[PDB]
Design a protein around this ligand. Structure first.
Ligand code: W71
Ligand code: W71
Ligand code: W71
Ligand code: W71
Ligand code: MYR
Ligand code: MYR
Ligand code: MYR
Lengths: 61, 252, 284, 238, 61, 238, 238, 284, 61
């Protein structure tokens, strides 16, 4: 059961850009890297404040 | 109670008023060889009641300083009635067994025996490298005994009890079918051994399928009672015995 | 047809811990009769208050297939490229699993075993030290031949038996991936026996022990046409990896060190090591 | 040919690899299978079986079998300690050579609860109550019954049922402990004390033995296959 | 006829974790190991008693 | 065998390769995952967090902490300059060791806007207005407030809201600039001047400190992974 | 190229391998097949054919053909033994060079029943009854007809039907025996005795010969291909 | 189309043993007439009481394809890298299967054979011993050329014939997997003959025997441009593995040792070995 | 067009035991061996008699 997914864009304008993969080993540790997960959240760090703060309104009182 | 137990094979019946349970092989009840597991083509004999019955071996004495005993099967039964006769006239044999070890004392005695059946109990010589003869391990229903000290006599097997003659830890013999006779609660032990081997049938003289070992883990002790030794008796019944390859009887 | 669904999407875990509260009853789980030859099925919830624990631990690495399924060195020997002694130039090994202690102890934890066998060979060569070592020897090629019981055995590196018209052989050249092949379950019995409490003769005489059932044949190895001006010594190491395994009637692990390759023989060894008293629990 | 490119690892021999390879005996007809009793599928089945623990593995041991006998006697001082052992099933001499310890020694990690079964082997006429406890790790082991009773324990009463099971729960900060246990991976102590005393009527022996069995529970497992420190050699055998 | 089955779980949370296998030899002895059979029964060894014994009830009489 | 033909690259070990390889511990049962707080998924999440900029990293520094304090005083000459810094977030000493600069130093290219937050740390009784500006590159940096006010700027008034944010936009001829910045890749200057002056009532200190924080905006990204110049060794440690 | 990784066994030459390889004579037009009589498909077809057994392979043999003639005579002592042979079809000199023995010698394991056909070659006027028996292994071979008659046997009567077949059944503890037979793999003995005696009328020869043929039954098979000990060389021929 | 179902899910076994009880009849299976040239089809159930046995044994390893299908050494010779004697530098072999005893005996168990042939070559090199051995020779490459009957034969390592514009050749470099290729059934007849009881001339004169039908050509092998300062000796071993085999009219196996490569010639050898008397059944 | 067929049984009880093959060469001589044809007839050799003979009935007259 081959998995087919999109490649990272190259020098040329984008369909021919997809690659195929098949796992050959019984352990997931053997698999290649997860180079393509781009989920991202900076708010645990940039805004850990209990009460949410909208930019337009003043910060204090 | 469940302590009460009655077993009937052939023309013999065994009863016990204070027992534990009945241990059965590796959960496997003895059974005749199936057509899809056989190689030897001749029609076998299944003597039934004549061979599948209880045989009582010579008794032994459990004394304060006893260390342990062993009996090899089927050798131990080679002289027992028609079971022994059938062993002699046939090249191949196969059987399971009901082993009933008896030992009664009193509410004032203390002691505890391990009753185990060790399949393929291959043993080491008293002096490494020195071969011993069959007589060093089995001879009819004669009980063989282990020793505390390490054995020096090269004509013997390494009898030091803590290694059970096999080079392993005696306290680990519990992975084999076993039962304990703790004088405080039991009075006997019953183990049903099915046929266990790497081939469907085998010659009964040449191969000792399993060895029965009775080992005192807690020494026999008592106070000012007039009774001194406590006898231990072994009664065993072959089960589903069948033989193939009839010919002249083997001299011994 | 094309794809097949042998997916094991439902794998086994270790038992969960059930929440358990106070109790006051006639039902008593912690008291038993060890005499029955029964091991108690008690769990913490039977004797104390437990919280619920969803346990995801799995016994995957302890299956017999996994425990036995790693290649282990079962033998090693040297053979020279050139020597005055005919026997120093080839190896003749009676196949068995009793000479290398580690593999032996593992297999011996079971009485009977049934499996296919993967065999891998590691062969390395070194130039023997000497006064004049300058030479330019081409790459070496080795031949490993299996001789089933009864087949003609080679008496020297250059004898006819090495033709292998029927025995299986492997020709391997240095610098390459180690040689390997599979052998199926070849016993004449229904399972291999690690122990045999018996004799070879009906008389109850002859050989005693497992050695009487060992007749798997030999492995013979030589250099192909490798005679060099100055001697080179090759060492062959043979690895066994059982696969598609089944095991019956488990035994206590070997406690005493091994003394002989073909017998159970041992020297009495104490149960375990000692401590000063029955209450000592510190280290210093 | 189909264009290919070898990656690292090519030609290596990894001992724990799992590939296919040609069969040297093509079409060999295997001997038919036979249903032999006692098949084992997982080593944990073995570790789940009781084996006798050499609890009395003391220095002055004359007779090897004495190691399996825990001494218990009449007129023992009140609250006296019967024994004490440290929970390192794969490392401590009390456990390392039992069935459970031997299996553990082929692995590097372990996790789960254990069953310590105690069986009284005195006469039917003797009586007694014992407090058996388990103390999770801390800087100091219990030195008194008062200290011990604050941890996980069971009070054993002798009667028709000769055996009692202390089940030591898995209480740990990590999911697994090391077989080659260290301080970080400390498991604690198991101790036994007289709850009342062993009382006896006239005409019965003055002292008796208690035996200890050990096995794993159904939540027990091992990880990380490794060679055992218990077997070695200086030469090929023969 | 390729067989497709699940892999042993890795460092990351689980679908992309399945591998594919095809046998190349005529003898089953040539096949890879059965690393994934987890059938297991400890009762032949832990409880070989003829009469079944429930934990709650006493052992003797 | 299937006919194949090895192509260039066969057998090589490329550090950034991405292939599968056999597992040495077949069937190892991984410890279950646990939901630990603070998971990071992209290094940009870190670069988006403010860190204190050592703006006052002057030569005569006696006390290290002084580097974080920008001096501001009463009766300052009209239109006086408070500070001036050059925009090379990965190269200039003012930024190179901040969170943002450290992340940048593991890459060779960067692009995006930046937030420079200034916080007044004097007493509640002090007042003041400052002009903070950004000057896109050109042959000469601003030398006077008059020069500075022609570029991108904000006029900061001190009140309840102690902090003010100068957001320096991405104004460049190229999509990306180099971390190891050069003239071609020049980014400009950020300067601060007194708009009015810091006025104070009786009984308050005569001078105060201003602090500067820096972080990346949501249009910021880095490219070309590289080793950092900030760590080295002459020997293996131990 | 497609990423690949060589596994152990790569480049080796295993004699019993089974791979495809390029044809050096592309498109060679093979000579048409022709239906020649006597096609063989399995070597067991050959082993199933009778060949004359040299039963009388005794020491003092002057004339080679005598080996095939088993002597039988008038006025033989009652219950006299005619011959005795041990069942090792691949090892014993009586069988090793017969069709069956030769086929067995290219294998290491064997299993199945055998047919021993005896043909009386005296005149039509002679009469006689013989007891032919098979004794499964045991510590001692039969020394007397009384001993022999307890095993598997047939009582052969001479008449129009000149031949008699003793079919020795497969009675063994193992599924297969070794061709290079040993004690563990022992098969037993086949012996022949006078049941009555060879009686003759006036004017007929006083002694006659019996011949023995051997072949495999339909339950017979061999395993484990191996080279035969029966052929060798010191030099290339020519 | 994609996948194909040539699955042999129904494979042949050896005959089962049927249960058989007592009998008393006029029907007599054990008595026959060997004179008819018929081998009796008797089984144990015909002459004794048998139990039922479900027999799973199979004759898979004894098919002719399997018996003949293993590579066997059929020839070996040496050729030097440098020598004064032109003929010592290349090999010229008239293809045949009669020089190596093991393969010969196997093929000769059948009168006619028809099969395709897999040929594998094992070539190894060694530096000749001498007083001065220091040199640094690059890897060696060999050429193996097949010359069908009548083609130009090379007279020296460097002659024009080695151009192989039409004859098939293999160029192989040391250190690599042994060279191999398949040849189809190339006889001018419908089957290869292992024996030929006849002459070459119609006169009943000329050559006698199988050698008259052997005209498969030659194999020629040389080093490519391998002249080394100090001589190196290469040894080539050629292996034959018949495949897709058919065999007709089986014969008794060769009893007497072989004496000649191209003739049946032998020295009388006794039927078998002897024992003291017709009743001797013991070993000592 | 791949051919899929059953393997020769191994140490373990039998579906996962089938292998797949694809021919890569233009000549049938290049193909692997016919290790799996078990057709067999011993009667050309064991009983080449014109008149068929049933075991139960006598051989002569
Ligand atoms: C390795 C090893 C372990 C042993 C015990 C042998 C167990 C083998 C099981 C069956 C293997 O196949 C056989 C081959 C030949 C013989 C044989 N028995 C008598 C002498 O040869 C028996 C079984 O000793 N060495
Ligand atoms: C006895 C016994 C059984 C065991 C396991 C031992 C059996 C191992 C299988 C035997 C493997 O033997 C070989 C067969 C052939 C070759 C070989 N074939 C190609 C060249 O080498 C090598 C090993 O444990 N005790
Ligand atoms: C090997 C071997 C075995 C033999 C007998 C030869 C059998 C070959 C069968 C047919 C092969 O193809 C032929 C090629 C040439 C000739 C030929 N006959 C007269 C001289 O050349 C005949 C058949 O001798 N050497
Ligand atoms: C005669 C006879 C027939 C046989 C079998 C012998 C026939 C073997 C087939 C002939 C194979 O000859 C070769 C053909 C070409 C090559 C070769 N081609 C590429 C380079 O080498 C090698 C061997 O048995 N008796
Ligand atoms: C997934 O397997 C479904 C489709 C099958 C594609 C054929 C696989 C191509 C050859 C690689 C096999 C991998 C064996 C390690
Ligand atoms: C199974 O074969 C059904 C689907 C076919 C998949 C194509 C196989 C990919 C190439 C490997 C062929 C294996 C030949 C040894
Ligand atoms: C048969 O070809 C039908 C299905 C196609 C399967 C794909 C083949 C897998 C790659 C091997 C190609 C062989 C080229 C020599």
């Amino acid at each position: 059961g081959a998995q087919v997914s999109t490649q990272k864009t190259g020098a040329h304008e984008t369909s021919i850009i997809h690659y195929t993969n098949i796992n050959y080993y019984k352990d997931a540790a053997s698999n290649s890297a997860n180079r393509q997960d781009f989920t991202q959240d900076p708010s645990k760090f940039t805004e850990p404040v209990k009460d949410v703060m909208i930019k337009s309104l003043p910060a204090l009182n | 109670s469940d302590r009460v137990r009655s077993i009937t094979l052939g023309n013999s019946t065994i009863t016990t008023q204070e027992c534990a349970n009945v241990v059965v092989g590796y959960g496997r009840w003895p059974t005749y060889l199936r057509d899809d597991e056989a190689t030897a083509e001749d029609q076998p004999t299944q003597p039934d009641v004549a061979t599948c019955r209880f045989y009582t071996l010579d008794s032994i004495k459990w004394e304060k300083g006893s260390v342990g005993w062993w009996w090899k099967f089927p050798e131990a039964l080679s002289d027992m009635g028609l079971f022994g006769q059938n062993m002699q006239y046939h090249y191949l044999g196969r059987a399971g067994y009901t082993i009933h070890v008896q030992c009664n004392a009193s509410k004032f005695h203390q002691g505890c025996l391990l009753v185990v059946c060790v399949p393929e109990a291959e043993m080491g010589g008293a002096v490494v490298g020195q071969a011993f003869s069959a007589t060093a391990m089995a001879n009819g229903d004669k009980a063989y005994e282990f020793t505390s000290a390490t054995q020096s006599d090269q004509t013997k097997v390494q009898t030091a009890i803590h290694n059970a003659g096999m080079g392993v830890g005696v306290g680990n013999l519990t992975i084999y079918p076993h039962q304990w006779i703790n004088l405080r609660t039991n009075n006997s032990a019953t183990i049903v051994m099915p046929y266990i081997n790497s081939v469907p049938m085998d010659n009964m003289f040449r191969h000792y399928n399993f060895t029965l070992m009775v080992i005192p883990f807690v020494k026999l002790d008592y106070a000012d009672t007039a009774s001194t030794y406590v006898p231990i008796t072994v009664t065993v019944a072959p089960m589903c015995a069948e033989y193939n390859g009839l010919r002249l009887a083997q001299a011994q | 047809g094309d794809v097949e669904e042998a997916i094991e999407r439902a794998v086994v875990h270790v038992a969960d811990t059930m929440r358990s509260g106070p109790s006051n009853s006639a039902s008593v789980p912690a008291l038993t009769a060890v005499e029955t030859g029964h091991t108690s099925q008690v769990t913490p919830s039977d004797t104390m208050q437990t919280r619920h624990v969803k346990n995801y631990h799995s016994r995957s690495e302890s299956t017999v297939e996994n425990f036995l399924g790693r290649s282990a060195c079962v033998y090693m020997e040297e053979y020279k490229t050139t020597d005055n002694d005919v026997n120093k130039k080839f190896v003749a090994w009676p196949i068995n699993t009793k000479q290398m202690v580690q593999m032996r102890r593992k297999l011996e934890m079971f009485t009977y075993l049934r499996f296919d066998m993967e065999v891998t060979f590691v062969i390395t060569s070194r130039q023997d030290p000497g006064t004049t070592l300058a030479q330019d020897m081409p790459v070496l090629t080795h031949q490993i031949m299996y001789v089933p019981p009864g087949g003609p055995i080679p008496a020297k590196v250059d004898d006819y038996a090495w033709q292998t018209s029927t025995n299986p052989s492997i020709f391997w050249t240095e610098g390459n991936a180690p040689a390997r092949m599979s052998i199926p379950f070849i016993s004449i019995g229904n399972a291999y026996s690690n122990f045999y409490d018996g004799w070879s003769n009906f008389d109850q005489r002859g050989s005693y022990g497992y050695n009487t059932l060992n007749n798997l044949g030999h492995i013979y190895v030589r250099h192909v046409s490798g005679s060099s001006p100055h001697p080179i010594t090759s060492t062959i190491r043979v690895y066994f990896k059982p696969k598609h395994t089944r095991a019956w009637v488990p035994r206590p692990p070997r406690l005493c060190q091994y003394k002989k390759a073909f017998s159970v023989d041992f020297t009495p060894t104490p149960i375990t090591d000692t401590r000063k008293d029955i209450n000592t629990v510190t280290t210093v | 040919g189909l264009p290919t490119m070898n990656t690292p690892g090519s030609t290596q021999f990894l001992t724990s690899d799992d590939f296919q390879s040609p069969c040297a005996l093509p079409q060999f007809d295997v001997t038919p299978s036979m249903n032999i009793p006692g098949e084992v599928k997982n080593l944990m089945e073995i570790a789940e079986v009781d084996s006798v623990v050499p609890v009395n593995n003391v220095q002055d041991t004359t007779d090897q079998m004495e190691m399996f006998r825990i001494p218990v006697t009449i007129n023992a001082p009140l609250q006296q300690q019967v024994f004490g052992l440290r929970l390192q099933p794969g490392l401590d001499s009390v456990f390392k050579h039992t069935l459970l310890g031997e299996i553990l020694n082929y692995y590097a990690h372990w996790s789960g609860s254990m069953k310590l079964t105690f069986v009284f082997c005195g006469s039917a006429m003797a009586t007694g109550k014992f407090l058996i406890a388990y103390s999770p790790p801390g800087a100091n082991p219990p030195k008194t019954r008062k200290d011990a009773m604050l941890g996980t324990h069971i009070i054993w009463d002798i009667g028709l049922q000769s055996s009692c099971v202390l089940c030591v729960p898995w209480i740990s900060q990590t999911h697994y402990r090391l077989v080659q246990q260290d301080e970080y991976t400390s498991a604690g102590y198991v101790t036994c004390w007289y709850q009342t005393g062993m009382i006896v009527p006239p005409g019965t022996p003055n002292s008796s033995s208690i035996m200890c069995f050990a096995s794993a529970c159904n939540d027990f497992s091992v990880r990380m296959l490794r060679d055992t420190p218990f077997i070695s050699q200086d030469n090929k055998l023969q």
